[PDB]
Scaffold this motif. Structure first.
Motif, short mmCIF file in Angstrom:
data_model
loop_
_atom_site.label_atom_id
_atom_site.label_comp_id
_atom_site.label_asym_id
_atom_site.label_seq_id
_atom_site.Cartn_x
_atom_site.Cartn_y
_atom_site.Cartn_z
N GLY A 1 -8.18 14.61 -7.83
CA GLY A 1 -8.68 13.24 -7.93
C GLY A 1 -8.23 12.36 -6.75
O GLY A 1 -8.35 12.77 -5.61
N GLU A 2 -7.73 11.15 -7.04
CA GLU A 2 -7.32 10.18 -6.04
C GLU A 2 -5.85 10.38 -5.66
O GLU A 2 -5.33 9.62 -4.86
N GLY A 3 -5.16 11.39 -6.25
CA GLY A 3 -3.84 11.76 -5.74
C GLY A 3 -2.71 11.58 -6.74
O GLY A 3 -2.93 11.24 -7.89
N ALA A 4 -1.48 11.85 -6.29
CA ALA A 4 -0.27 11.83 -7.12
C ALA A 4 0.50 10.50 -7.01
O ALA A 4 1.42 10.23 -7.79
N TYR A 5 0.16 9.69 -6.00
CA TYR A 5 0.80 8.38 -5.88
C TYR A 5 -0.11 7.47 -5.05
O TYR A 5 -1.15 7.91 -4.60
N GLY A 6 0.25 6.18 -4.95
CA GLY A 6 -0.46 5.26 -4.07
C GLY A 6 -1.72 4.65 -4.68
O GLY A 6 -2.39 3.88 -4.00
N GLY A 7 -2.01 4.90 -5.95
CA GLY A 7 -3.10 4.23 -6.63
C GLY A 7 -2.64 2.92 -7.28
O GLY A 7 -1.57 2.41 -6.98
N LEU A 8 -3.46 2.40 -8.19
CA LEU A 8 -3.11 1.23 -8.96
C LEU A 8 -1.79 1.50 -9.70
O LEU A 8 -1.69 2.49 -10.42
N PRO A 9 -0.77 0.64 -9.57
CA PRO A 9 0.46 0.79 -10.32
C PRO A 9 0.29 0.88 -11.83
O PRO A 9 1.12 1.49 -12.52
N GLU A 10 -0.73 0.20 -12.39
CA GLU A 10 -0.83 0.16 -13.83
C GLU A 10 -1.66 1.33 -14.37
O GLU A 10 -1.87 1.38 -15.58
N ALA A 11 -2.10 2.28 -13.55
CA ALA A 11 -2.82 3.45 -14.04
C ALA A 11 -1.93 4.70 -13.96
O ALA A 11 -1.11 4.83 -13.06
N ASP B 1 2.74 12.06 -19.15
CA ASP B 1 1.55 12.14 -18.32
C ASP B 1 0.56 11.00 -18.61
O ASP B 1 -0.33 10.76 -17.77
N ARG B 2 0.74 10.29 -19.73
CA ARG B 2 -0.08 9.10 -20.00
C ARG B 2 0.62 7.80 -19.57
O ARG B 2 0.02 6.73 -19.71
N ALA B 3 1.85 7.86 -19.03
CA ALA B 3 2.53 6.68 -18.54
C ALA B 3 1.92 6.26 -17.20
O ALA B 3 1.48 7.11 -16.43
N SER B 4 1.90 4.94 -16.92
CA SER B 4 1.48 4.46 -15.60
C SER B 4 2.44 4.89 -14.49
O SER B 4 3.64 5.10 -14.74
N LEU B 5 1.94 4.90 -13.25
CA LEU B 5 2.77 5.12 -12.06
C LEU B 5 3.95 4.15 -12.04
O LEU B 5 5.09 4.56 -11.81
N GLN B 6 3.71 2.84 -12.30
CA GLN B 6 4.82 1.88 -12.28
C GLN B 6 5.89 2.20 -13.33
O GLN B 6 7.08 2.05 -13.06
N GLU B 7 5.47 2.59 -14.55
CA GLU B 7 6.38 3.00 -15.59
C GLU B 7 7.24 4.16 -15.11
O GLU B 7 8.46 4.14 -15.27
N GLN B 8 6.61 5.19 -14.52
CA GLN B 8 7.38 6.34 -14.08
C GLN B 8 8.41 5.94 -13.02
O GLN B 8 9.57 6.36 -13.11
N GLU B 9 8.01 5.12 -12.05
CA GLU B 9 8.94 4.74 -11.00
C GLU B 9 10.08 3.88 -11.53
O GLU B 9 11.21 4.02 -11.08
N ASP B 10 9.80 2.96 -12.47
CA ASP B 10 10.83 2.12 -13.07
C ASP B 10 11.88 2.94 -13.83
O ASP B 10 13.04 2.55 -13.90
N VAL B 11 11.45 4.04 -14.46
CA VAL B 11 12.38 4.87 -15.21
C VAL B 11 13.51 5.38 -14.32
O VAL B 11 14.66 5.47 -14.75
N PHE B 12 13.16 5.78 -13.08
CA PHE B 12 14.13 6.39 -12.19
C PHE B 12 14.83 5.40 -11.25
O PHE B 12 16.02 5.58 -10.98
N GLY B 13 14.07 4.46 -10.69
CA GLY B 13 14.57 3.56 -9.66
C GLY B 13 14.28 4.03 -8.23
O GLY B 13 14.82 3.47 -7.26
N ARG B 14 13.42 5.05 -8.11
CA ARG B 14 12.97 5.62 -6.85
C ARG B 14 11.44 5.69 -6.94
O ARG B 14 10.87 5.78 -8.03
N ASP B 15 10.75 5.63 -5.80
CA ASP B 15 9.30 5.78 -5.78
C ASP B 15 8.95 7.27 -5.86
O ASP B 15 9.77 8.16 -5.55
N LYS B 16 7.70 7.59 -6.27
CA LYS B 16 7.36 8.99 -6.59
C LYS B 16 7.08 9.80 -5.31
O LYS B 16 7.52 10.94 -5.21
N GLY B 17 6.30 9.22 -4.39
CA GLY B 17 5.82 9.88 -3.18
C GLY B 17 6.94 10.30 -2.22
O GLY B 17 7.13 11.48 -1.90
#
Ligand code: HEM
Ligand code: HEM
Lengths: 362, 363
Positions: free
Chosen positions: B58-68, A232-248
């Protein structure tokens, strides 16, 4: 709320649409009497025919002799069948009893040790299993409870696992569910309508070398803890890179839609989807059928969370084993730990009202 | 319907329709700073407004800054509101912090020790609770997981319980649910339609002595294990005699229908209904809102199952305490054991978009 047919060439609960709830139990056998064990399998089959149709076991839940315990414990009275399926499997340890040693299938292989394994021996193994799946948790608990009661003195529960929600799909036409990491899980599986793929990858065949298993399957169960504080402290990009699919959407990296086909070379070399894909494993393909769990807190201020991973295959040596070996360098390993393990041979279906669970073996 | 309004004179999740699933969590507070705690209550209220309408925090589950890190953990994307309610309560132990000791309500009484209690300290107590109820268990768990994450550094999770009632898709709304002993459970209760009985027995009034609690209620939670395998070996007659109702229809002894009013003198003296009935307890009446649980199997192969009992009342001293004291000789005691306990003051509702959980206490 409808019933799923109990009889067929195969057991239900495998290719069947995935139901909302799971109650899985593993049992050890406590009798040395082959005839008594056979009698149990027949009585269990009779109970299963009632349970999966939404009827009470034996003579019912009330209205019998006042001085006797009721045949059925009664907590499913007035409920619909709720798509209940009951699927039985036999563990390797069973074949040391009742003169069965020479009938253990070659495809029922013991798993090797995998890097990172931390298996609790008390919530691993088992002489046999019953997988109960239904859309109503009360219906599933009722089934396991009544089977255990009937088996008193012949079998004991070794360990059990409840699953509060599904993380798998055999119906690509319906919404794919999400696991507790927040990603869709089940996009590229085997569908219940794909008869050729089921014959190639899931059902055991006569030619495979064990005649009694024809029409059955092999099951691997893995209890997997998730490190959700770390995730839960990983970035969105980190999470997506782990799988190879986007989250949304859950689309392969670079593509727009969930069900667009993956282009593996755009993924990181240690991405989960890249490592697990059939094309990376000499064509090896699995039917995944797992569920999410949470068993309280961890004692350290946090929720406990995990995934109870279930896979069906024609041969453990050619299904789960090569895929999990290829996951030795998976980016996902940073966030998970396998803490329980069991394998089972799942016999063929109950053909009609005169047949019984395990009849081809015994 | 699909959603339950969050705003009101009272918090939802008490008198509003009973949902199919529960995730109940008790939290301990780790900060000593009153301002930091108030900031948390505001943030939690904003999150709850989103969650109960089926939106991400908050601002949601996806679609924000990639590095956050995403603001919402994402496991409820694609699900419906599912009638989610989020109900907060404050334990007695909160009032030793933040200078609050003279604002603890007298009606928030410590429970006495009752005969046969075997309470696990690790699954008892807590400074705060959130009761999350919804028709889909993943919607409830996602709510608790995200509140805990928002609060990380100021609160921790002390203990957590999942529970289930009916499955509404398959089971009519008017059917009484059965508990795991196979008996109908809830026949004679306070219903959310009974406005006057709620005012008499459930909601705290201004004249009761604690002005900040007006329109709130008091909650008792008890984790009650059932000895399932022993019960299942009892005769039908033994089971019916324990309760004072029959198992099939759930009618009182000597009557024909579930909802026929009981004749207490026809039951055994230590039957559960006879002991619990208001006429046996000076008129004391409770709102029960509990859920069944099945956690797994214990080390002996036995089913770890029971009732997660929840009762709301205007005053713990005149609600739960007298009734539970009268169960000292209950025939049911042979088959159950109380293994966890806690009490909470549940504040009034969030009045509008600018209000927040706990505003009447904190200012
Ligand atoms: C907690 C553990 C795991 C999580 C959270 C997880 C998650 C995912 C996700 C999000 C997908 C992509 C969507 C899909 O096609 O289903 C996926 C695919 C897959 N996973 Fe996992 N998985 C886990 C463990 C495993 C294990 C243990 C195996 C097998 C040994 C495995 C085998 C697969 C396979 C075969 C695919 C499909 C690849 C393809 O053909 O495109 N997974 N997993
Ligand atoms: C596992 C524990 C328990 C079980 C299985 C159980 C079961 C039942 C059943 C089957 C009924 C009758 C149907 C109904 O009116 O709901 C009932 C009634 C009742 N129970 Fe319990 N109960 C339990 C614990 C408690 C506790 C701890 C209390 C209160 C301290 C309580 C208070 C009541 C009340 C007030 C009634 C309604 C009596 C009336 O007005 O007719 N129960 N319970």
């Amino acid at each position: 709320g409808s019933a799923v047919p109990f009889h067929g060439a195969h057991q239900a609960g495998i290719a069947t649409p995935v139901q909302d709830r799971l109650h899985f139990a593993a049992f050890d056998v406590t009798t040395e009497d082959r005839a008594a064990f056979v009698a149990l399998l027949k009585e269990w089959t009779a109970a299963a025919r009632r349970l999966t149709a939404g009827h009470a076991v034996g003579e019912g839940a009330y209205g019998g002799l006042p001085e006797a315990p009721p045949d059925d414990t009664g907590e499913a009275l007035g409920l619909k069948p709720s798509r209940l399926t009951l699927t039985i499997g036999f563990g390797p340890s069973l074949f040391t009893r009742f003169g069965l040693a020479d009938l253990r299938p070659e495809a029922l292989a013991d798993l090797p040790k995998f890097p990172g394994d931390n298996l609790d021996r008390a919530r691993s193994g088992g002489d046999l299993c019953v997988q109960a799946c239904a859309d109503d948790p009360q219906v599933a608990v009722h089934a396991i409870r009544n089977l255990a009661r009937i088996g008193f003195g012949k079998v004991v529960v070794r360990w059990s696992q409840l699953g509060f929600g599904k993380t798998s799909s055999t119906t690509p036409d319906k919404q794919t569910p999400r696991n507790l990491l927040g990603f869709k899980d089940g996009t590229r599986n085997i569908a219940g309508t794909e008869k050729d793929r089921l014959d190639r990858f899931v059902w055991a065949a006569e030619k495979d070398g064990t005649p009694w298993m024809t029409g059955g399957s092999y099951l691997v169960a893995r209890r997997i803890r998730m490190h959700i504080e770390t995730w839960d402290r990983a970035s969105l990009q980190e999470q997506e890179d782990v799988f190879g699919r986007d989250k949304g959407e859950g689309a392969p990296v670079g593509k727009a839609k969930e069900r667009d086909e993956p282009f593996l070379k755009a993924m990181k070399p240690d991405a989960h989807v890249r490592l697990a894909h059939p094309d990376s494993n000499g064509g090896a393909t699995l039917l995944r059928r797992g569920y999410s769990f949470t068993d309280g807190t961890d004692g350290l201020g946090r929720l406990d969370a995990g995934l109870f991973f279930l896979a069906y295959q024609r041969d453990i040596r050619t299904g789960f084993v090569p895929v999990q070996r290829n996951l030795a360098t998976d980016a996902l390993n940073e966030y998970i730990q396998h803490v329980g393990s069991a394998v089972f041979a799942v016999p063929p279906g109950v053909r009609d009202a005169d047949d019984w669970w395990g009849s081809t073996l015994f």
